[PDB]
Structures are given as C-alpha cells and as structure tokens.
Design a binder for these strands. Sequence first.
RNA 1: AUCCGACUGUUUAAUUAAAACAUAGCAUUGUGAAAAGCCACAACUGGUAUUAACACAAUGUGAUUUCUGCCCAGUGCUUUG
RNA 2: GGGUAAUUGGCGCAGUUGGUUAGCGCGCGGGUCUCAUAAUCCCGAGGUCGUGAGUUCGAUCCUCACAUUACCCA
RNA 3: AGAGGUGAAAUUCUUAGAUUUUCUGGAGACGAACAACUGCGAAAGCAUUUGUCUAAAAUACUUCCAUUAAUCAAGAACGAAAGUUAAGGGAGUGAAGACGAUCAGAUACCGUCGUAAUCUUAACCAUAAACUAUGCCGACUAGGUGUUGGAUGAAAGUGCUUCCUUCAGUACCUUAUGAGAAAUCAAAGUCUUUGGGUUCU
Lengths: 210, 40, 133, 95
Amino acid sequence: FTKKEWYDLKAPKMFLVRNFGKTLVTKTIGKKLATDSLKGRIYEVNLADLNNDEDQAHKKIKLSCDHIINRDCYTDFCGLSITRDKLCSLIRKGYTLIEGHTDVKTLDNYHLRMFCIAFTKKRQNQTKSTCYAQTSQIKKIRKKMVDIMTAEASKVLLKDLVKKFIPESIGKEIEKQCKKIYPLQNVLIRKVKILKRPKLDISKLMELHT
Amino acid sequence: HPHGGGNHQHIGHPSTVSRSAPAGQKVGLIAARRTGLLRG
Amino acid sequence: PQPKEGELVFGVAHIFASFNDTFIHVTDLSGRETLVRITGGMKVKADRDESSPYAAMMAAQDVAARLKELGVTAIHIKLRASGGTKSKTPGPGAQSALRALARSGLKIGRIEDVTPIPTDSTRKKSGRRGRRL
Amino acid sequence: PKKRRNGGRSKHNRGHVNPLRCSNCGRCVPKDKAIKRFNIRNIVDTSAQRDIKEASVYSTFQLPKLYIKQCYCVSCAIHSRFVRVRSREQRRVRK
RNA sequence: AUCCGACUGUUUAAUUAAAACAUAGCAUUGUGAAAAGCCACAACUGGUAUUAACACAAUGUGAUUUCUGCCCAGUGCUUUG
RNA sequence: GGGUAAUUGGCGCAGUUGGUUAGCGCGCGGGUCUCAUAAUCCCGAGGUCGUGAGUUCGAUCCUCACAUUACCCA
RNA sequence: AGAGGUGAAAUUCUUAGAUUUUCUGGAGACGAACAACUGCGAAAGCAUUUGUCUAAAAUACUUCCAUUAAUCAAGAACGAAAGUUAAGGGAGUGAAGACGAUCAGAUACCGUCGUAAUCUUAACCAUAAACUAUGCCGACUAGGUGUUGGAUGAAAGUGCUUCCUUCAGUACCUUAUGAGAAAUCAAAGUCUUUGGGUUCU
Ligand SMILES: [Mg+2]
Ligand SMILES: [Mg+2]
Ligand SMILES: [Mg+2]
Ligand SMILES: [Mg+2]
Ligand SMILES: [Mg+2]
Ligand SMILES: [Mg+2]
Ligand SMILES: [Mg+2]
Ligand SMILES: [Mg+2]
Ligand SMILES: [Mg+2]
Ligand SMILES: [Mg+2]
Ligand SMILES: [Mg+2]
Ligand SMILES: [Mg+2]
Ligand SMILES: [Mg+2]
Ligand SMILES: [Mg+2]
Ligand SMILES: [Mg+2]
Ligand SMILES: [Mg+2]
Ligand SMILES: [Mg+2]
Ligand SMILES: [Mg+2]
Ligand SMILES: [Mg+2]
C-alpha cells in the first residue's frame, strides 16, 4: 500500500541536464533498509532529453545508480542502444551490409563489446541497379573495423570514450579509412555492452558529479 | 523374507516402503519417489 | 510528491495488445515499482470483447484517473505486439488505448515499439500443412 | 499440361531451397515461392495522430513507423486477395 | 514330430535330480560422506572401506529374435506449507 | 464423548456491521434488434435448520441432519 | 484479480500470487532482416565470426608431352526424409495416447496436454513428383535486353570508377518458306530430301 517516498535522479556531468526524474520506494522497516532496493537499478534515457537537441533522438543511454546521499541517486554509465525504428529505416533491398564486433579493455580495466554496422554507397556515375560488394572486400572492411575499434577503445579511458560516443568519431574514422576498398554510407556504433567493472570507488564516482 | 511364501510366487504387498521402516522390513524399493519406465 | 513549479513528473506505460486482451501497465521510469494495471479484461463480461476498443478505452480512463490521484502528470509510451513466435502486429485495442490516453489530460512523452523479435526461431506451433480451417 | 514455364517459382541452377512459414496460417513454403510484402505503416490514424500532437512536449514531434515484412502461402495469400486469377495472356505480365 | 527349460552349472546325506535354484542380458529404487546410504552393538565403538556414482546398497524378470496396449477412482510410496 | 466449518429463492452464493433487517449471477414471463445466430437495456414474482431475553438484529442453552481430525475402566 | 484459447466456448493455470515489468545465472536447438527469375557442387545438398587443412573451376600464356580419346553390360563410390542398433542429449515441435468441443454420428478438420522421433557420436538401410517428368560427346543454323567471373583498348578521376571489344556461366523477350496431334519448343530445328558416335527403356 502507498506509504512511499520520492527521490531525485542525477546524471554525471558529461551530459547537460543532470536532473532527469524521480522514483518511488517504500519507507524502511525492520531490516529492510530502503537503500538496498535503490542501488543497482538501471534507467534508460533517450539522450535527446539528456542534452536537449533533437538530432540525437536515437541513441538511448543506460544509467545505473551506485551511491545515495540523503535523497539523491547518482547514476553512472552502463550502455547504449539505437532505437529499433532507426535501424529498420536503414536497410533497403539493393545493397549490402557489413557488421562486426570485438572485445576491448580500457585504462580503468573495464571490458566492452561494440557492434559496428555499415552499408555500401553509390559512386553515382555508375548507372547500375545494385551496389553489391565481393566477399573478399567485406573481409577486409570487417578487419579494418575491428582494428579501429580496438585502437580507439584501448587507447584512453572510460569517460573519454563516452565523450567520444556522443559525436560518433569512430564511425567517421572507419568510413574514412575504408574508402579505398568500397564507398560506405552511414556507419554507426550500434550497441555497447559493459562486461566487467573493476570495483566501486565512491571518491571517483562523486568526482564525476563534482 | 517379507516376499516369501505363497502358492504362486508373487509379492502380494506394495513393494515400495518408507524411509522410517525398521531394519528387517526395508526390503523392496526404498523411499521411491516414482516407479516405472523413465521417459525423460 | 513535492514537484517544483510547472515541472512534470514522468512515468512509463507498457501497452500490450494481443488479439485476445489489452494490458495497460504503468510503472516508474526504472521498470520496478509498478503503479497501475487495468488490463482491459476487468471491464467486460462476455469473454470476448476483451480485445475490443471499448474495453481499452474504459481501462485507459481508469488509468488516467488513478494517475492523477497519485500525482503523475506525464507518460512515456512503449508498445508491444506479443511477437515471439506468435503474431507480429498489435491488436485492435492499441489505437483506442492511445487515443483515450491522449484525450485524458496527461502529457505524452515518447513512443516506441518494443516487440520481441527473434533472430533465432525456435520452431513454430501447428506443424507443417498449417492451421487448416 | 505445364501451365507455367517456371513451374510457379523462381529457381534455377540450384537443388534445394530452405523454407519459411506463412505469416497468417503457419504452413511451410520454400522461400523462392512465397509472395513477399513489405509494409511501412503508421501507429494510429490521422485524427489520433493530431490528437497526440498537441498532447506532446517538444513542440515538434513525429510519430514512428512500423516495419513488418510479411510472407504468405498461395492458399492463404489469394484468399485475402493480395493475388487474383488472371487470363492466359495476362499471366505472363510481370511488373 | 509335440510340451518345458535358452545353454555349461546347482539341490531335499537315508523314498522326489525336475519344468525347481542360479546364470549372462533387461529394467526400477536409494545415496556426494566421517552430521551421507545400507547393516551390527548393552554401552563404548564397528562392517561395506586398502571404498567414492564406469561406486556401494535394495528389488523384480530371466540367452538371441519381435514386442511390451488402457486405468492414479481403492491401498501403498512420495512433493509443497 | 471433544474441536472446527457450513445449512438463506427454481440452482449457486453474498449479508454474522442491533434505532434500514434482506441482496446478486444462472433461472422465470413482455418490448430491443438480431441475411434464420449475436455483446443488448428496461422491468414482475420468487426466501434466512426449530422453540424463549437486562433488546430494534443474524446475541443464548439445547436439537435435528453433513464433513474433518482426534478420545475410550460400568 | 483474473489469465489462456475460440466462429462462440470448454478442457487448463491462479490470493500457497497466475498473466504482466525489471535484473542475474544455466540449458539445448536455430542463424531473421540483407537475400535476388543471384553464387558453388556429380547428384543428394550448401548461409553468424576467425584459423588450419583440402580440392575445383574459369581467364592469361611464342611453357612441356604428342592421340594419351567418346560412350560404357559386369563391378565400385556417394545417396533427402522416414525407419533400425548403442551411448549421450532432451528447450521448442510433436505419428501414438488421453481429454474438451462441433455434428445425426466424428476413431477428423479446431483447442488443452503429451510418448517415440527430431540434435550429437559410431554403425545399418538405398528409397522420393530423387523433376528440366527432357541420357552423354561433337557440328551447323537469329535478332535484342540483362546479369555473375576474368582479360584487351579507350574517357570522366579528387593506377579507381564508366564505356567498347572478347572468353566462360546463367536468365528473359521477339520471330521463324523450321518442327509438332496440339499445348508449345533456340531445341522438342538441320527427318519418306529418313544413316556423326554411343548406353538404357
Ligand atoms: Mg566481401
Ligand atoms: Mg513366476
Ligand atoms: Mg490377488
Ligand atoms: Mg480453405
Ligand atoms: Mg529436389
Ligand atoms: Mg536346463
Ligand atoms: Mg525367453
Ligand atoms: Mg547339466
Ligand atoms: Mg532324498
Ligand atoms: Mg534319488
Ligand atoms: Mg527359473
Ligand atoms: Mg539379473
Ligand atoms: Mg493413488
Ligand atoms: Mg539441461
Ligand atoms: Mg521436452
Ligand atoms: Mg503443445
Ligand atoms: Mg525409383
Ligand atoms: Mg524419372
Ligand atoms: Mg521414313
């Protein structure tokens, strides 16, 4: 029955809003602490409402709370997704799609999968119905995607990687080095799954919220 | 034996006994959850 | 709760329409801590009409009343179409539920389709030669 | 008397083709014989579409579409009138 | 040519040597351990055990071939709180 | 012999909440529209296991049946 | 406080919390969209990523040998699904079987359950509308539009794309003083103007 309390959710300062809603919970009773029920929850937000710009209306973002001061949860980063309708709008008949995945470790000892996706282009002066590519070219392109993901992700750091996700630098870079094999259309990082986390350290976490 | 005797060689008794039966009596299928052919 | 001035409070409404019933389930924005569930089949008694637009409209009205009672003033929409190895299109009640929710008086946040498509395909019921009518 | 030159399907230089299942009635049909339809639908009709518009935040909202890609068997397809019965000369007319 | 038992094997010392018992093959049941399964002792302690699921213990049927249908209302055994 | 539960309309069930003491689905008879079936809305009837209270009731010992578990010196 | 399921309903699950939403771990099958009158293989067949092993074409060649070839009774290798033997595995689907419905009857079509089987390893079986219902090798005979893989020659590029030839594979359209009983056929034509070689019926 409803004798509950409301809390405030706060995003890390990598984004622009930093107040994206509230949540309920039952008041604590004997040996039910009302704070073990809060921590570990996962929240999915669109990133258009986290940054206030409608061009980024795809790319849902997942957030998990780890620390609780008196009435606030602090909700650091967990993963990505791509909003199914956007993915469905990209697949037309007369082309070919390339796709690959990899495992990588950051400097903080996180582990991730990345799942890129790509499609071929026209090079318009061709005047032919289709734009198919041979298998060997697909193999070369996939190898390039895996190498570029590995370098970029294993290079720097977690929060810097997250800042890299927002403007989609990996896609531009992959597209640029794959031009000599075959022209490619819109290239995306389709999904990022967090695989292992080193250890909770609330000093760092609260340094993310200044 | 509990099975012994008779004019036709049968048991005459349910052959599944309980876990608490005494030593001279626990003789058939002990504390059987189930009997018959297994099908999975 | 204790909202600030002119600030909206959000929740998530999971809609399920399945050619036999219509679920309207509202939770907070984490998934846990459900708030209302009126599911359509509590509004008629014919054992059919559970998927009719009428029952969905009645259920949506009940949900809006309870949600205003609690203090929630906005809703995110997730739409489902019962799509495992079963049908992929939503049933006749989804449109009526959405329209009743829109005309209730709440504010509508966002709409998304979350039907569980498989890349996998365990085998489908009613083996070859199909369901013969 | 061989009413169709291709035998009702488009298969050449192959032995076997894997089947799929009818979206309506569940029957197995080879993929090269089933009729395919691709749909781009709206979630709601236009009146409800405009009703959602002024119930919305963001002042510039567009409803999403639905992508389906259904497939049917001959019996379950021409009972619904996606395909009809034509004359001897009109049968040969593709496109 | 028919009946029984598949076969080598065993049995009522002193009235019954068999179609009776055993047997390979088949199936069912319990148990992950020194606070376990099955059994001995008045107690203290032991057997399996110099063991460990391809193991130990408790029962049915009885080589091969071809098969092994329906019934959980009754009586047993068993699972949940 | 002891303990618990239940008995209300043609059937199945709610009322045991004393200054209102009786209710609902299947029923039953008339319009509604039903390519000959169908969600159908108005109504009329239908009664509390049995005898007595510092009381206006379903509050008291007992007595008839039914079910469950348990008990036993003429 | 109902859920499933149907033309409508039963059988079935659920206040001992069903259906529904979120997270965590395990298990076994499957490989959507892309995906085509497209590719490979003697046929049966073959579709997630990476590595190793192993063959096969086509194209280019002023490389080597020099008739080493075509088709083949007997004989040999492979051969879908179902089915049989043994050990695993056992989610979904589900011959048998049990119910609930419909019906004059319903051992059916519809629905709720559900055994074998379906999957892997090691052995059998040798059959399908195993179909292009068209054996294999060679020559000749007509125009066009595509497409898959090489090579040659030429233009727009910001050592790459378009165009022109030619070889190999694969479809379609039009037409036949060519053929058929016709449907139709680029072979099912070059057949009373009847004989290029060869196996099976
Ligand atoms: Mg490639
Ligand atoms: Mg006997
Ligand atoms: Mg008897
Ligand atoms: Mg029909
Ligand atoms: Mg075939
Ligand atoms: Mg003998
Ligand atoms: Mg025998
Ligand atoms: Mg002897
Ligand atoms: Mg003697
Ligand atoms: Mg003697
Ligand atoms: Mg014997
Ligand atoms: Mg034996
Ligand atoms: Mg019984
Ligand atoms: Mg398992
Ligand atoms: Mg199973
Ligand atoms: Mg089933
Ligand atoms: Mg044959
Ligand atoms: Mg033939
Ligand atoms: Mg002649």
